C-alpha cells in the first residue's frame, strides 16, 4: 500500500506581524497543529485568527491550536488559490502525527482500501427502544 | 405561655434575631410581641394548632422537641442499617404490590387515624374543658364518666349526650359538656373553628373505612383479590377500549417513574384540596381572626 506520509520538515513560516489569536498554554501541555503548504507566488491571504498575512514562495509552515482552524484555512487555500496542503498534530514531547488526507487522497472521493468504522446496516427507524438497553453498557445506536 | 392568655392581642413569636449589622433604630423597631430584644412574628400558625391539640406550657414543647429529635435519630439508623448485607430487602420484597397495599391502607392510613382519635379524646378534648391530662396521670382520668362500657354494650348513643354549650370559653370549664363524640357541624362560637368533638368523630369514622378497605388484596392467606386479575377482567366487550387494562399490571409494577407520576398526581390534588378547605372551615382555634396567618 502506497501510503508513506509526508514526514514534516522545518520550513519558513509566513510573514506576519503576530496577533492575539495565536497559541496559548494549551500548546505547551496538550497539543498544537501545523499545516504545511507550498505556493507558487507570494500573495496575501486572511488568517483564521483574524488579520491578513502574506504567504511567501514555496514551502510554508504555520501552527494553529485546534483542528477546526487548520482545516478552515485548508478549505480557503484549496478553494481560492488551488493549492495543496496537509496538516499534522504535534505533541509536547515531540512526536508528530500525520493527519489530514490520511491516505494521500482527500476524503471526498473514494479509495479502495479504507475501513468502514461506525456503520449500522439498517434504517434509522429500526433502532431499539430504550427499554431494551437498560442496565447495560449498550445504547440504541450501538 | 403568654399568647394562650389572650390569643387575639399577642403576636405569636417565631424566634429571636441576633444580626450584628443591625443599627440602633432597627433594634427598637423589631422588638415587639412583649419580648426583650428583636424577634420575628410567626405566621405559620403553629401557635393555634398546638393550642387546639392540647399543648399548654413550654414544658410540653421541650419534650415535644426531644421526642422528635429522637425519632430523627432513629430514622438515620434505619437508612444506614438497610444497606449492609443481611439487612437489605431483595427485589421481590419491594415488588410485592399486594402486601404493601394492605398495610398502607390498613396500618398506615388506618390505625394512625384511629390513634389520633385516641389522643383527641384523651388529651385534647379534656384540655379544652380545663382538664390537664399528661403521661403522668392519664390512667386515672376517664374520657367519659362511664367510659369503656357503653361502647361494649351497643348503646353508643351516650357519647353524644351532653355536648359543649353554646356559651363556651375554650380554655376553661364554663359550659363544658361531657360528650366526646358528637355531630354538630357548626362552628365553635368563641373561637370561630370547627368543634373539637366533630373532629374526633371524623377521625374515628375514617379510621374504620381504611381498616375495612385494607383487607382487599391477597397476600399469603388465600383470600382477597389479585390486582393483576382485576385489571384483566375489565375488558369492555365491543372493543371500544381495545384489550382494555390487560398488561397494565406489569407496566406499572415495573416502572418507578410510573408509580411516582401517580403519587404526585394524587398528592398534587389533595394539597389544593387542603388549601381550599382550611380557609373556609378553620380547624384550629383562633386562626380565622389572625388574618395574615
Amino acid at each position: 500500500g502506497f501510503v508513506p506520509p509526508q514526514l514534516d520538515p522545518s520550513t519558513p513560516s509566513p510573514i506576519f506581524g503576530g496577533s492575539t489569536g495565536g497559541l496559548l498554554r494549551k500548546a505547551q501541555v496538550e497539543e498544537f497543529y501545523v499545516i504545511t503548504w507550498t505556493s507558487p507566488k507570494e500573495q496575501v491571504f486572511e488568517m483564521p485568527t483574524g488579520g491578513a498575512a502574506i504567504m511567501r514562495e514555496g514551502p510554508n509552515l504555520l501552527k494553529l491550536a485546534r483542528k477546526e482552524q487548520c482545516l478552515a484555512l485548508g478549505n480557503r487555500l484549496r478553494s481560492k488559490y488551488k493549492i495543496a496542503y496537509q496538516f499534522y498534530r504535534v505533541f509536547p514531547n515531540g512526536e508528530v502525527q500525520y493527519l489530514h488526507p490520511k491516505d494521500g487522497v482527500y476524503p471526498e472521493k473514494v479509495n479502495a482500501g479504507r475501513q468502514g468504522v461506525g456503520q449500522n446496516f439498517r434504517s434509522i427507524g429500526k433502532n431499539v427502544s430504550p427499554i431494551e438497553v437498560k442496565f447495560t453498557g449498550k445504547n440504541s445506536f450501538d | 405561655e403568654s399568647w394562650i392568655q389572650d390569643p387575639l392581642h399577642v403576636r405569636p413569636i417565631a424566634h429571636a434575631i441576633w444580626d450584628p449589622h443591625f443599627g440602633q433604630p432597627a433594634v427598637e423597631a423589631f422588638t415587639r410581641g412583649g419580648a426583650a430584644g428583636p424577634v420575628n412574628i410567626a405566621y405559620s400558625g403553629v401557635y393555634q394548632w398546638w393550642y387546639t391539640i392540647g399543648l399548654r406550657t413550654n414544658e410540653d414543647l421541650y419534650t415535644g422537641a426531644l421526642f422528635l429529635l429522637f425519632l430523627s435519630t432513629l430514622s438515620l439508623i434505619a437508612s444506614w442499617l438497610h444497606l449492609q448485607p443481611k439487612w437489605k430487602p431483595s427485589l421481590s420484597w419491594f415488588k410485592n404490590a399486594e402486601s404493601r397495599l394492605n398495610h398502607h391502607l390498613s396500618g398506615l392510613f388506618g390505625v394512625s387515624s384511629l390513634a389520633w382519635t385516641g389522643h383527641l379524646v384523651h388529651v385534647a378534648i379534656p384540655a379544652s374543658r380545663g382538664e390537664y391530662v399528661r403521661w403522668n396521670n392519664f390512667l386515672d382520668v376517664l374520657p367519659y364518666p362511664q367510659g369503656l362500657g357503653p361502647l361494649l354494650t351497643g348503646q353508643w348513643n351516650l357519647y353524644a349526650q351532653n355536648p359543649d354549650s353554646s356559651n363556651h370559653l375554650f380554655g376553661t370549664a364554663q359550659g363544658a359538656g361531657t360528650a366526646i363524640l358528637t355531630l354538630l357541624g357548626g362552628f365553635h362560637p368563641q373561637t370561630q373553628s370547627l368543634w373539637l368533638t366533630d373532629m374526633a368523630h371524623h377521625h374515628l369514622a375514617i379510621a374504620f373505612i381504611f381498616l375495612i378497605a385494607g383487607h382487599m388484596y391477597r397476600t399469603n392467606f388465600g383470600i382477597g383479590h389479585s390486582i393483576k386479575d382485576l385489571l384483566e377482567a375489565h375488558t369492555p366487550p365491543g372493543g371500544r377500549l381495545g384489550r382494555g387494562h390487560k398488561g397494565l399490571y406489569d407496566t406499572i409494577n415495573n416502572s418507578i417513574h410510573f408509580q411516582l407520576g401517580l403519587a404526585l398526581a394524587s398528592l398534587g390534588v389533595i394539597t389544593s384540596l387542603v388549601a381550599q378547605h382550611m380557609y373556609s372551615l378553620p380547624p384550629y382555634a383562633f386562626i380565622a381572626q389572625d388574618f395574615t396567618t
Partner: protein, 146 residues
C-alpha cells in the same frame, strides 16, 4: 502574544523581574515574607478609616483586627491552592527557559514544599505588616491625613 511597549521595555522588564514573585533564585520562605509585608501594611488603612467604627475611638484597633483576619483568610485560600494544585513529590511547573533561550532552574515556588513555605512567609509577614501600620499610625502619628 505581541511585543508592545507595555509588554516589553527595559523599564517594565526591570520592574517586574525584580519583585519577590519573580526573583526565581531566592528561597521561597523570604519571597513569602516580603509579599506579606507589603500587602499587610497596605490594607490597614481602609478598614480603620472606612469601617463601621471609624467615628469611635476604637477605629485604630478595629481596623487592625479587620486587616488581621483578611490576611488569615487569604492564608487559608493560599493553602487550599497549594494543597490542591501540587503533589508532595512532583517537580516544578514553572517555565525553565528564558527569553534568550538559556535553560534556567525551575522555580522552587511552583512546588508543594515551596508553596507551603511561601504561605508561611505570607502569613507571618501579613500580620507583621499589619501591626507595623498600627504602631506608626498611632504612635509616630503626626504628619498623616487620618
Amino acid at each position: 502574544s505581541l511585543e508592545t511597549p507595555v509588554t516589553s521595555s527595559p523599564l517594565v522588564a526591570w520592574y517586574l523581574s525584580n519583585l519577590p514573585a519573580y526573583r526565581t533564585a531566592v528561597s521561597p520562605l523570604l519571597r513569602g515574607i516580603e509579599v506579606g509585608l507589603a500587602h499587610g501594611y497596605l490594607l490597614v488603612g481602609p478598614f480603620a478609616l472606612t469601617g463601621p467604627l471609624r467615628n469611635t475611638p476604637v477605629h485604630g484597633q478595629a481596623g487592625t483586627l479587620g486587616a488581621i483576619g483578611l490576611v488569615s483568610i487569604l492564608s487559608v485560600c493560599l493553602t487550599m491552592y497549594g494543597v490542591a494544585s501540587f503533589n508532595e513529590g512532583e517537580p516544578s511547573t514553572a517555565p525553565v527557559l528564558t527569553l534568550t533561550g538559556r535553560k534556567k532552574e525551575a522555580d522552587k515556588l511552583q512546588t508543594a514544599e515551596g508553596w507551603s513555605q511561601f504561605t508561611g512567609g505570607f502569613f507571618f509577614g501579613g500580620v507583621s505588616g499589619a501591626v507595623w501600620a498600627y504602631f506608626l499610625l498611632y504612635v509616630l502619628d503626626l504628619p498623616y491625613f487620618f
